[model samples]
Target: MNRSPDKIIALIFLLISLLVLCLALWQIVF
Candidate 1:
């Protein structure tokens, strides 16, 4: 029952982290 919230939060965190990382890399390259 509570499992979905935990999984969803983790997924959101992963997506946000990945987006930030890519943004940082792009800025560095430019």
Candidate 2:
């Protein structure tokens, strides 16, 4: 696969989504 900026952007967004999910779960448990 090519190393494109668009791919990096997508990966960044996915990471952000996962971070949000983790925070939500933490909030629910705490």
Candidate 3:
């Protein structure tokens, strides 16, 4: 069960979620 692509995909998903969260906070602060 060594799926490197799955790990990469999950990492990308986390990064996207983080970016969205940052954008949401930026909007709220502004």
Candidate 4:
């Protein structure tokens, strides 16, 4: 009935993935 929770879950995953990606890249570059 509600899709908002689904969208929020996706957003959290995306944020976490982005954060990990950034940390990995930072470690690689620095």
Candidate 5:
């Protein structure tokens, strides 16, 4: 499970979600 590219995609997905949330919050605040 830790020797393939599975975690890579998972990390990207999580990071993208966080990015979206961050941008959304920033937009709401501004």
Candidate 6:
């Protein structure tokens, strides 16, 4: 299986988005 750079970039973006979402939720709760 070949891993493309685009896929890696997409995954990184997704992770960053999820991290930001989690931080926002935390701020709302606390």
lDDT of 4 by residue, 1-30 (tens): 267658878888999999999899888764
In model 5, the worst 10-residue window by lDDT is 1-10
**lDDT tens string, model 2, 1-30?**
387668978888899999999899888754
Looking at model 6, residue 17 earns an lDDT score of 100
Over the stretch 1-30, how does candidate 3's per-residue lDDT look in tens digits? 288669888888999999999899888754
| TM-score between model 4 and native | 0.70
Model 3 lDDT at residue 9: 82
**Judged by lDDT against the true structure, how good is candidate 5?**
0.86
Consecutive 10-residue window with the lowest summed lDDT within model 6: 1-10
Q: Pick the lDDT winner.
A: 5
**Which residues of candidate 5, in runs, are more than 4 Å off?**
1-5, 28-30
lDDT, model 6: 0.83
lDDT of 6 by residue, 1-30 (tens): 257658888888899999999899888754
Off by over 4 Å in 2: 1-5, 28-30
lDDT of 4: 0.84
Higher TM-score: candidate 3 or 4? 4
Candidate 5, 16: how far from true, in Å? 0.6
Q: In model 4, where do residues sit more than 4 Å from their true spots?
A: 1-5, 28-30
Per-residue lDDT for 1-30 in model 5, tens only?
Answer: 476868888899899999999899888764
Q: Lowest-lDDT window of 10 residues in candidate 3?
A: 1-10
By lDDT, is 2 or 6 better?
2
Across 1-30, the per-residue lDDT of candidate 1 in tens digits comes to: 357558887888999999999899888754
Candidate 1 lowest-lDDT run of ten: 1-10
lDDT values for all models: 0.84, 0.85, 0.85, 0.84, 0.86, 0.83
1 or 2, greater by lDDT: 2
Off by more than 4 A, model 1: 1-5, 28-30
